[PDB]
Design a binder for this molecule. Structure first.
Ligand code: CL
Ligand code: NA
Length: 128
């Protein structure tokens, strides 16, 4: 599923992401823009052999099990494939755990380099 900008904002808000760990909805929509271009089916392999999965590109190195990342953990206790569903519930639940892990949204390198400190409210501008 390729979400619309305000469609995804509304889905994140309904799953309790807005203001979560103090990160406004625009921060989450911006992160998803640059991680997945709003595509729930996005996957990208990392140089170390782990893979990032879904709307928020959650890494198999720590958070989901894809069965092919040696030495990884599954701290969200989910198959990585469940992070590719059109329903974003699993991705939100796991992102809440990631963003609580200590470094906030800096866990998302694309958030740090492309959203952090910018006018993230623009990402939810015009959304109902
Ligand atoms: Cl923080
Ligand atoms: Na893993």
């Amino acid at each position: 599923k390729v979400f619309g900008r305000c469609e995804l904002a509304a889905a994140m808000k309904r799953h309790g992401l807005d203001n979560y760990r103090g990160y406004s909805l625009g921060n989450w929509v911006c992160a998803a823009k640059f991680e997945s271009n709003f595509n729930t089916q996005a996957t990208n392999r990392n140089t170390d052999g782990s893979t990032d999965y879904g709307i928020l590109q959650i890494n198999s190195r720590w958070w989901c099990n894809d069965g092919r990342t040696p030495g990884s953990r599954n701290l969200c206790n989910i198959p990585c494939s469940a992070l590719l569903s059109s329903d974003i519930t699993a991705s939100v639940n796991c992102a809440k755990k990631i963003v609580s892990d200590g470094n906030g949204m800096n866990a998302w390198v694309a958030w740090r380099n492309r959203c952090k400190g910018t006018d993230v409210q623009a990402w939810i501008r015009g959304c109902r």
